[PDB]
Amino acid sequence: LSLTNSSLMPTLNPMIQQLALAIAASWQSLPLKPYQLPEDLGYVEGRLEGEKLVIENRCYQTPQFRKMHLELAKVGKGLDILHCVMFPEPLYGLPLFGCDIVAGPGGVSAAIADLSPTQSDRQLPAAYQKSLAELGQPEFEQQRELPPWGEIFSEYCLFIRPSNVTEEERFVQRVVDFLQIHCHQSIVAEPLSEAQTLEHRQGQIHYCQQQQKNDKTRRVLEKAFGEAWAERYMSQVLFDVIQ
Numbered sequence: 001l002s003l004t005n006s007s008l009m010p011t012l013n014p015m016i017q018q019l020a021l022a023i024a025a026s027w028q029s030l031p032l033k034p035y036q037l038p039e040d041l042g043y044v045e046g047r048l049e050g051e052k053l054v055i056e057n058r059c060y061q062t063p064q065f066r067k068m069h070l071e072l073a074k075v076g077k078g079l080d081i082l083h084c085v086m087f088p089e090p091l092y093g094l095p096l097f098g099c100d101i102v103a104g105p106g107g108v109s110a111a112i113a114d115l116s117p118t119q120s121d122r123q124l125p126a127a128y129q130k131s132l133a134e135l136g137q138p139e140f141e142q143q144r145e146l147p148p149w150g151e152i153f154s155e156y157c158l159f160i161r162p163s164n165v166t167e168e169e170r171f172v173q174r175v176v177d178f179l180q181i182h183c184h185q186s187i188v189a190e191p192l193s194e195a196q197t198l199e200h201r202q203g204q205i206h207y208c209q210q211q212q213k214n215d216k217t218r219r220v221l222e223k224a225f226g227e228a229w230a231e232r233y234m235s236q237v238l239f240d241v242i243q
């Protein structure tokens with residue numbers, strides 16, 4: 001899991017660095033095993049007519065989390081990206097943890113984090129609603145409205161442009177807080193009925209299908225690797241539909 005030997009880390013936006021370290025710290029002592037991505041993917045680079053895209057992939061699994069994926073990326077010199085999803089094992093009915101950070105020379109442009117529902121009623125489990133409410137409403141000066149496919153995210157979803165360092169740190173700490181809640185709930189979660197497992201499975205499939213509608217990600221991938229490679233990456237590596 002260690003980020004100390006990452007070639008990208010030293011060159012990424014500081015907020016992305018802190019988030020990557022936080023996520024790695026949350027996962028480090030779990031009962032991890034490797035999760036083999038398609039073609040045993042780790043590092044990948046590509047270029048067509050413009051800038052090069054470089055991606056480093058780390059991916060694990062535990063009994064509660066089917067797939068725990070941390071991706072770090074850079075387009076050319078200046079655009080940095082962090083992607084992370086923890087895909088739950090439907091048996092336990094846990095929500096989906098996700099975060100996405102995009103940064104350029106002007107600073108972080110997008111910071112998104114959520115614990116996303118998998119229940120058919122589109123609500124988080126009661127224990128999560130309670131814990132998340134207790135954190136209080138965070139103040140951020142530059143909130144961004146989610147795109148329509150973003151109906152999958154919970155009412156606790158953050159989507160901002162950080163205005164300053166105070167806000168960058170407040171966002172990172174809130175993701176820490178999400179992870180702490182999530183890891184704890186994973187150990188207390190009652191395993192579920194076959195019908196309930198099916199319900200949660202469908203929520204996760206819908207989440208992936210909706211995430212694949214993000215043309216921001218797709219355009220970045222297509223400009224470095226082309227349409228076919230991007231469709232494979234989005235549907236097989238990033239947001240794989242379990243089935």
Ligand SMILES: C=CC1=C(C)C(=O)N/C1=C\C1=NC(=C\c2[nH]c(/C=C3\NC(=O)C(CC)=C3C)c(C)c2CCC(=O)O)/C(CCC(=O)O)=C1C
Nearest residue numbers: 073081083084085098099100102109110112147216217220
């Ligand atoms: C948990 C949520 C979540 C996960 C897990 C996730 O992967 N994305 C997620 C969310 C989400 N991301 C968004 C934006 C962008 N994403 C990238 C690119 C990548 N993001 C990547 O992960 C990778 C592979 C490394 C690339 C290449 C770019 C360039 C932007 C534009 C940045 C900006 O406008 O300032 C938006 C706003 C969408 C919109 O405005 O229409 C939302 C909602």
